[model samples]
Target: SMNPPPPETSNPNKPKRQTNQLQYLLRVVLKTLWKHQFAWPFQQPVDAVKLNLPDYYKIIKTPMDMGTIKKRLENNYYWNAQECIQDFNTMFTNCYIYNKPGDDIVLMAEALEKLFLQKINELPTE
Candidate 1:
């Protein structure tokens, strides 16, 4: 039997990129949220000392932010997408709890939360 071996055929059905699908979608949605114009305040940790908000810590027990959550996601801190979603909610809720209902930040939080939730719902279902 004779001859040089035939070249291996590539399998088109095989997936090249393997990842946790849910987390991948969450990361994508998070990037869009961070890009929002109103994402400014939520981008990083609130500076109570610099901002002179003496009551900030007293009011908001569980402070959360986009930056912190982003790092947590990158570091694989969240075991599930629901946990990540919870942090996002916490970030927005903290704003609502601290600011007046009519405040600009509160409005922005509402907008961002709406957008985030919409995106979350749109993610592929298991």
Candidate 2:
């Protein structure tokens, strides 16, 4: 099947090895944030699955092969903000529908919201 379906278009490297533009960008972007607090928090497993960013580490193997890691991680961040927000929403959705939770979502949300609003407020307000 040529077309998989939205957020589900072509994945050339999924089969026989190949390269593509979105694949390149996704690899570069994710690797930069690979081990960041927001993403690869393999430091804790229960919360990591709860957060859903177990992601690349779950798939891409160690002894770190560049091409394989890049391709798989690329699939995860295929739409940057789009995929991330959707991923985040799933955590919240779990809360909304099933009452799952973490230790500090309220604090994290407030801190992030406050920081973002603070930066926005810094703009020239005429």
Candidate 3:
């Protein structure tokens, strides 16, 4: 009989618990940001600020290969500011809400950056 084929590699296409973890963490961060909206100067509606599935994809897609991001998400990897900002910028681009003539999108982005930085500082360090 032919030797059993090596165990198949984990299917990157399939959803994993790590993605759930990242999503869950994102939710928590969104909630925290919303609750403390007064602290954020720009003050968009929480719903507007929160990233949907597509928005999340937009942000991470540039810097991270889809397969790696997917795998890490499945593994609930904790991301840093650079990663978060990359994703946020992508979302902003998708929304067509960034620095369009006379728009305050730049200010909004700055505020978001500051807010996220503050939030990151508050987290327990690795």
User: lDDT winner among the candidates?
Assistant: 1
Candidate 3 local lDDT, 46-110, one digit each (tens): 23234333343333333322223333334544344345435444434433442354455555545
lDDT of 2 by residue, 8-123 (tens): 22475544222343343344433433333443321122233444544433432221222333444444534443333243333333323322244454434334334434433443
Superposition TM-score, candidate 2 onto the true structure: 0.26
Q: Residue by residue across 1-126, what tens digits does model 1's lDDT show? A: 112222122334533332364476446778889899999988878887777888887887788888877766665565566766788888988898899998999999999888887888777654
Q: Rate the local accuracy (lDDT) of all candidates.
A: 0.73, 0.35, 0.41
Local error of candidate 1 at 50, Å?
A: 1.1
By TM-score, who's the top model here? Answer: 1
Ten consecutive residues with minimal summed lDDT in candidate 3? 1-10
Q: After superposition, how far is residue 9 of candidate 2 from its true place, in Å?
A: 18
Q: What ranges in model 1 sit over 4 Å off?
A: 1-22
